[PDB]
Design a protein around this nucleic acid. Structure first.
Ligand SMILES: Nc1ccn([C@H]2C[C@H](O)[C@@H](COP(=O)(O)OP(=O)(O)OP(=O)(O)O)O2)c(=O)n1
Ligand SMILES: [Ca+2]
Lengths: 956, 393, 392
DNA sequence: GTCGAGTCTAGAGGAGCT
DNA sequence: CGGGCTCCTCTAGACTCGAC
């Protein structure tokens, strides 16, 4: 079963091609084939035969439609039909007015006509509009919620708001969540409301789905980050009248209009306490009802627009599948948090010890006014403040004498205890110490007071001055208009001590071995430091950008090379920078990760598979984290999650980097998923191919993309990486930047950043050679620009339109880069939607026990039972094949190359990580996952291994 | 100026100049600590006791004799204990023969008490009692700070802080790693240079796994702490008999506990911290500095100022803060010399109770870290000192 | 019996052949278990603050457990002999009858010796501590350490005060120390009449007092006082007297040395007998366990978390706490109360369901046997206050 | 009437993901 | 003309209100 292209590219095997495209395809146009040959041989690419990859023989499930497009339409309609019915039931429903009074009872209360309140276990209907309020003072347990049904209002009150007990359990369970159980729940952030639903944390997948009005708003009238900034600042410019921000008030104004919404000025659910919520119960319930009603009106105004602008049901089904993400955790999650926090505290304590010692040594410069001669600390606040106001041995004394001397001493001490009257009610904050030292010390009244300058950190503008950082023998100086830099002495036009700068530079040059004498970035004369020039530090993004802290991770090579040095010398500077590099991720993500809403299931809620499995431990915890995903958070309709889509991968020098490795499947369950290989690059190629001659590999770019293998390291990313001598993970950035609009300057800067051996001229030559290339990538760019400049920019595969704020009529020539990148990125999102729909179809038809775990822009992880891991692998490979075939069909190409027909390898692992073989060595996990947490290495399997293990069948 | 000379003149050390050499200090053959050094060692032992017994689950105290039962070991170098009266009785009075003198000397090496070299044997003797105390619920531990004798022939004495941890064999390696990390963090906590404290896995003559902590002294690294993953052989040697009296309850099954020995040298640790701390200022940790408050006086009226200083002393002492009464010193010295003296003595605070205190109560408080002078009311001094000491912990 | 109760409750430790009246006073075995060690540490802390912190010009001293060793007679203390040296002589080359006599002579003449009293160690540090006080007499040196006396070898933990005082006020200082030590012993005693002072004369005719404790078998000299004079200091510092004389007024005087030698081990025995339903009413400044935390109902996890927080707070506040909630098999409330009373536990705290509702916990006092409900946040302050009031 | 301390917000540079 | 996001800490600026 071997097939070949007119351009000799190995296409699909006969067995798979007959079942996908079918026989009777029209013969290729001879003129088109000759044109493709002429274009392909022009760049010296014609010839060079590729080794025939082994053929594949699989009996795919019947495609019960007419072709690929009809099959996917039918699948998506079947998947998202009942949810559309629930949505339609809301639009045509008349609701009784908001009840005058809100019940104080615990549980769910159903408001009938005329405000009567009735106790009900759970809401009865299937369609709801939901808003959940949480008292942030008492953690993450929900406080109250108001729901709208097609026939009645609903309100929910927790036991913590009513009973008022002294202490509540700090670990959450399904018992103290919001019960809501083919069901649809609408809301502005359904994910936040979903995270508080009791039935959502069960391993068994409840068929409830969530439609988000903010995601629909991004799909319909969304804005980019620049567009959002401009719109907020102003709160062609006609896009402002058709678009709004993600806030519910702005969305309600845009779609429904009418009186503006008002938020509670008190903000008791965020800043207040539980007692305040008890006192202001009715007011908060009314505000929640207002939010729910506004959400309902927004949904009414948004659903028809979203259906019209995204006519393909695959988009809606993919959004519904992206709204049910689920991440399992165990008791090791708590250990991960503790250990990461302990390591962070230890490293921060070491760094603060060094910084505090340096600061304390600096405080001795007040004597003799010696701080004015320090090259670093001359500009600080060294001012002081006055304190504000309104013989022979006598022998052993006898017992009475001792008593008298003790009582007289006490009385004298206690008499003055009442002279406190002469002092201000507000205690001064360290008047004796200098001002810069005062700013670094907490006030004695603070509940978190620590001795010394405990507030010091590497991110402060005084820390580089304390460590006496020198760049090529030049002290670092901060300019508010230009960021960090350094002072080069020798210029001859509290005062800056340029004499000290000259002395330090002379000492450094005579010691290390150095000799208009410096070029660097550029002498900015606006700073006007007497006797010194201000040169900005080199930034990784160009000379225009400013450096905010010389302790960035990009200055570690400059620290090692000796250009950047610390004043105390030794390893102090390198240690500080290495601690900063190991703690930056945790410093920025510890609140997010630690405050993740983890609901620990009891043993009864766990299924029999988890408990019966040998790996089950009766002394361990079992729970789940539901990531709060916005299914369409970008103009490209990508998912958005503040933490899990920003979760750093395991690194040898990053505390807490094992975050995803801590997402561990429960016993009896395994995580099966795969990553699409060269996804958007291949989408761009197949677009360019369908625009030139209507066959795979017709363009040179498509020919380069198709020919190669990832295992052998000869794919286009690997080829570019070998050409420029950088890692493939950086060749990804290079190629994607070139595809998405990066110029030669970006290429040069990226090469110099990633290849320290290259000079400016070598990087420039490499960039110009790879960009000069009537080029290889001309057809792709032409098709992308043609789609973008059309009056109705739509996705080439599913037809989903661009946001109304990005149509060419509204915006004429503005933000064109975003609108041309939208084609490829929304094509990738359509790829994800098709993958989700096909995976759900395969899981449903063949009864594979599993559910959607998480997706990050190219990945599709599934919590599959261990008994069905290889069936899931085969299903995922089939879905990849079908998605590529769907792209080819919708672009007009009636064939599929074999190279891109399957995943390189499907990862079957007990935890989420980039690679199967990784043991996740980390400062917080120094022994690895196998030694500390007992997670073995799984299996990464190609198509042939899966076929061998499953006999090429999805049924058992 | 050398650290040893400064610590000797400030009474952290003791001994003649022939005893202040590196070899003499490391040997442990002489008392090497003055009153300030003894207080510093007491503070270090108190911190060790806190962190290893008070805040650790299932750790209990134990005291064992400096003398161990005599054993006819092949090559043990432990010094033996003999009765001088018996030696005189054999030598003098009735006259024995050449063979009899051989028999007596053999009996000395056979049946005579020997000075302890490690605290492991003492801890293993009280294993059954601590089993009874915990209802045989593993894991537990026995901690003890005492003096152990090392042959050098001179006899050297070293203060040893040892925790014998009885853990099941399943989690021995995990508990050993936990103890290694905990001890390294404990040593680095009070250290101005945590990098100078390190670790290095090592093995013994019998191939048992282990690790040793080190402190980079100016001459070289020294093993200030050892952690051995000992087996069940020591328990069986100390308890030859029924296994039912040795087994502990690990979860649901009885297991002979694996023994981990965490032996640290408090004397060598004090020396390490004296080197770590070292204008001439010993930046010792606030939780280890021997003297935490120093008091002075003004320029009259002397009687009332003294009365106030006595009251403030008593107030500070009753709260548990060591105080140096520098006012009672009849020798006059300038405040600069007094402050330098307090710096070299690792005095955290120096209080100046002047005549102006009698008016309002404002006493000049100077901190060792910043050398800056801050005014505070007398009633607030005790609370500030308590807060500072509880926050530095 | 008291000894059996102390043994079962880990105040004592030893075989029944070691927990006898003669064996306990001997010191040839480790007679203190964990609770006994904690009680002895409390006694040492009370002695130390009352003599070295609350006193003027009293300083710490640490000395070796070995003495230089001399051929002088009347020294029954066990000597140090190198094991390798004895093996080398007996094996390898064969000595003669005379040679082995010389070897035994060398051991008596030159070898280490175990200290009998802490007096010599303090006297060796006389010059350094005199320089610490700028030669200004008077001053005192204190030390708590184990001393070795022939019985086998017995070990007694001694708290000795060596007070250097001018010859003029020797009797006044001696009486001052006598009354202060008598008050210190009687401070913690439920029966302060059991402590007595008797004038005693040294074998050289020097006067002093021997503080006894009226044990059920008879008085034992828990503490002994002596006006040793300048003889010992002159013996330990032969040569020039300039380094011996201290500055007292305008005169330079060799200070008379006062010995105040206690027995912390015998003092611990005395206080165990004084403290003795079966309850050991130890003084709050001496009781090893001061708080006992227990749980009373379900849920176990939440109550255990509350108890963990309370235990952490109390430990951070310096209060010794017995984690009784961690016991897998817990006895009845009456059995726990009896066990705590036998173990000299000041207070018993029980955390129940009501604690989760309002924070009120059942607090029990050992001395009165009266239950009380107190708020959680007010337990730590109550305990700290109670300890401060008992101290003063 | 005025100075200084919360307090709240906005902007800039850095850093995680894809 | 790399793009689509997310959040953080630090710092400057404006606003508010109590104590002298
Ligand atoms: N700096 C980046 C990184 C990623 N992407 C987009 C393009 C990719 O198609 C998609 C996934 O990123 P990957 O790093 O996974 O790129 P590949 O899919 O090519 O990698 P692999 O072949 O290893 O799956 O995200 C991008 O535009 N810019
Ligand atoms: Ca990819």
């Amino acid at each position: 079963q071997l097939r070949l292209n007119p351009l000799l590219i190995q296409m699909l095997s006969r067995g798979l091609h007959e079942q996908i495209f079918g026989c009777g395809g029209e013969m290729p146009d001879e003129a088109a084939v000759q044109r493709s040959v002429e274009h392909l041989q022009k760049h010296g690419l014609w010839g060079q035969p590729a080794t025939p990859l082994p053929d594949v023989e699989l009996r795919l499930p019947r495609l019960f439609g007419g072709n690929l497009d009809q099959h996917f339409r039918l699948l998506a309609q079947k998947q998202s039909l009942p949810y559309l019915e629930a949505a339609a039931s809301l639009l045509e429903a008349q609701l009784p007015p908001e009840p005058k009074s809100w019940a104080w009872a615990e549980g769910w209360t159903r408001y009938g006509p005329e405000g009567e309140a009735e106790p009900v276990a759970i809401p009865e209907e299937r369609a709801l509009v939901f808003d959940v309020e949480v008292c942030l003072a008492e953690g993450t347990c929900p406080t109250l919620a108001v729901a709208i049904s097609p026939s009645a209002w609903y309100s929910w009150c927790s036991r913590r708001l009513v009973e008022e007990r002294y202490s509540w359990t700090s670990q959450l369970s399904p018992a103290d969540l919001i019960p809501l159980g083919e069901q649809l729940v609408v809301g502005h952030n359904v994910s936040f409301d979903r995270a508080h639903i009791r039935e959502q944390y069960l391993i068994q997948d409840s068929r409830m789905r969530f439609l988000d009005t903010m995601s629909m708003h991004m799909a319909i009238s969304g804005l980019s980050s620049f567009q959002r900034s401009l719109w907020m600042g102003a709160k062609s410019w006609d896009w402002m009248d058709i678009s709004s921000a993600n806030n519910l008030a702005d969305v309600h104004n845009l779609y429904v209009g009418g009186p503006p919404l008002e938020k509670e000025p008190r903000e008791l659910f965020v800043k207040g306490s539980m007692r305040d919520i008890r006192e202001n119960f009715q007011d908060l319930m009314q505000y929640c009802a207002r939010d729910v009603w506004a959400t309902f009106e927004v949904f009414q105004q948004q659903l028809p627009l979203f259906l019209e602008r995204c006519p393909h049901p695959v988009t809606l089904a993919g959004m519904l599948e992206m709204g049910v993400s689920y991440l399992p955790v165990n008791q090791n999650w708590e250990r991960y948090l503790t250990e990461a926090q302990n390591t962070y505290e230890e490293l921060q304590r070491e760094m603060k010890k060094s910084l505090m010692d340096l600061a304390n040594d600096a405080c001795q410069l007040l004597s003799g006014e010696r701080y004015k001669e320090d090259p670093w600390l001359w500009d600080l606040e060294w001012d002081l403040q006055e304190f504000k106001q309104k013989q022979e041995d006598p022998g052993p004394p006898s017992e009475e004498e001792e008593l008298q001397r003790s009582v007289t001493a006490h009385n004298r001490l206690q008499q003055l205890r009442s002279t406190t009257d002469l002092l201000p009610k507000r205690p001064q904050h360290l008047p004796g110490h200098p001002g810069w030292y005062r700013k670094l010390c907490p006030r004695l009244d603070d509940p978190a007071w620590a001795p010394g300058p405990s507030l010091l950190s590497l991110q402060m503008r005084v820390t580089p001055k304390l460590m006496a950082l020198t760049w090529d023998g030049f002290p670092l100086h901060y300019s508010d208009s230009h960021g960090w830099g350094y002072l080069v002495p020798g210029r001859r036009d509290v005062t800056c001590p340029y004499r000290a700068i000259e002395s330090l530079y002379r000492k450094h040059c005579l010691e290390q071995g150095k000799q208009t004498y410096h070029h660097g970035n550029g002498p900015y004369n606006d700073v006007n430091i007497p006797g010194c020039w201000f040169f900005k530090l080199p930034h990784k993004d160009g000379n225009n950008y400013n450096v905010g802290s010389p302790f960035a991770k990009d200055f570690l090579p400059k620290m090692e090379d000796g250009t950047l040095q610390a004043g105390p010398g030794g390893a102090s500077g390198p240690r500080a920078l290495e601690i900063n590099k190991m703690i930056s991720f945790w410093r920025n993500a510890h609140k997010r990760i630690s405050s993740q809403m983890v609901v620990w299931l009891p043993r009864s809620a766990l299924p029999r598979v988890v408990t019966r499995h040998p790996s089950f431990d009766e002394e361990g915890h079992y729970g789940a984290i539901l990531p709060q995903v916005v299914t369409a958070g970008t103009i490209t309709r990508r998912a958005v999650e503040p933490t899990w889509l920003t979760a750093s991968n395991a690194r040898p020098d990053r505390v807490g980097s094992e975050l995803k490795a801590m997402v561990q499947a429960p016993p009896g369950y395994v995580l099966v998923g795969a990553d699409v290989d060269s996804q958007e690059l291949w989408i761009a190629a197949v677009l360019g191919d369908a625009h030139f001659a209507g066959m795979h590999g017709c363009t040179a770019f498509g020919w380069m993309t198709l020919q190669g293998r990832k295992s052998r390291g000869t794919d286009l990313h690997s080829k570019t990486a070998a050409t420029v001598g950088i890692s493939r993970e950086h060749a990804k950035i290079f190629n994607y930047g070139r595809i998405y609009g990066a110029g030669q300057s970006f290429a040069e800067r990226l090469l110099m950043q990633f290849n320290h051996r290259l000079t400016r001229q070598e990087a420039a030559e490499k960039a110009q050679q790879m960009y000069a290339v009537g080029g290889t990538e001309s057809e792709m760019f032409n098709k992308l620009e043609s789609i973008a400049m059309s009056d109705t920019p739509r996705t080439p595969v599913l037809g989903c339109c661009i946001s109304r704020a990005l149509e060419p009529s509204v915006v004429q020539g503005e933000f064109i880069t975003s609108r041309v990148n939208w084609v490829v990125q929304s094509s990738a999102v359509d790829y994800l939607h098709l993958m989700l729909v096909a995976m759900k179809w395969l899981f449903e038809e063949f009864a594979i026990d599993g559910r959607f775990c998480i997706s990050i822009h190219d990945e599709v992880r599934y919590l599959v039972r261990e008994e069905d891991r290889y069936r899931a692998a085969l299903a995922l490979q089939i879905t990849n094949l079908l998605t590529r075939c769907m792209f080819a069909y919708k672009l007009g190409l009636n064939d599929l190359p074999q190279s891109v027909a399957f995943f390189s390898a499907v990862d079957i692992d007990q935890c989420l990580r980039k690679e199967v073989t990784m043991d996740c060595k980390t400062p917080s996990n120094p022994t690895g996952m196998e030694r500390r947490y007992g997670i073995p290495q799984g299996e990464a399997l190609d198509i042939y291994q899966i076929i061998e293990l499953t006999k090429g069948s999805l049924e058992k | 100026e050398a650290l040893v000379d400064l610590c000797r003149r400030r009474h952290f050390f003791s001994g003649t100049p022939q005893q202040l050499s590196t070899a003499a200090l490391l040997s442990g053959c002489h008392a090497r600590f003055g009153p300030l050094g003894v207080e510093l060692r007491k503070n270090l032992a108190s911190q060790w006791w806190s962190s290893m017994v008070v805040f650790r689950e299932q750790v209990f105290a134990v005291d064992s004799l400096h003398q161990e039962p005599g054993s006819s070991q092949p090559r043990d170098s432990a010094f033996r204990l003999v009765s001088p009266e018996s030696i005189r009785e054999i030598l003098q009075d009735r006259e024995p023969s050449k063979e009899q003198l051989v028999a007596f000397l053999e009996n000395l090496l056979k049946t005579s008490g020997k000075l302890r070299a490690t605290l492991l044997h003492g801890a293993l003797e009280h294993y059954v009692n601590c089993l009874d105390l915990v209802n045989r619920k593993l894991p537990f531990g026995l901690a003890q700070i005492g003096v152990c004798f090392h042959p050098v022939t001179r006899v050297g004495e070293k203060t040893e802080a040892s925790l014998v941890w009885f853990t099941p064999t399943r989690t021995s390696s995990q508990w050993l790693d936990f103890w290694l990390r905990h001890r390294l963090l404990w040593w680095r906590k009070f250290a101005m240079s945590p990098s100078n404290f390190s670790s290095a896995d090592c093995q013994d003559e019998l191939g048992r796994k282990g690790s040793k902590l080190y402190y980079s002294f100016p001459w070289g690294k020294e093993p200030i702490e050892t952690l051995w993953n000992l087996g069940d052989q020591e328990l069986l040697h100390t308890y030859p008999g029924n296994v039912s009296t040795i087994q502990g309850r690990d979860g649901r099954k009885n297991v002979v506990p694996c023994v981990l020995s965490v032996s640290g040298d408090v004397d060598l640790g004090t020396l390490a911290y004296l080197y770590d701390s070292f204008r001439k200022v010993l930046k010792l940790h606030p939780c280890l500095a021997p003297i935490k408050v120093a008091l002075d006086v003004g320029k009259g009226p002397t009687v009332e100022l003294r009365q106030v200083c006595q009251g403030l002393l008593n107030e500070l002492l009753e709260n548990g803060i060591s105080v140096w009464p520098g006012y009672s010193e009849t020798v006059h010295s300038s405040l600069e010399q007094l402050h330098s003296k307090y710096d070299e003595m690792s005095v955290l605070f120096s209080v100046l109770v002047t005549e102006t205190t009698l008016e309002n109560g404002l006493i000049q408080l100077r901190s060792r870290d910043t050398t800056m002078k801050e005014m505070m009311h007398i009633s607030k001094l005790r609370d500030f000192l308590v807060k500072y000491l509880a926050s530095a912990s």
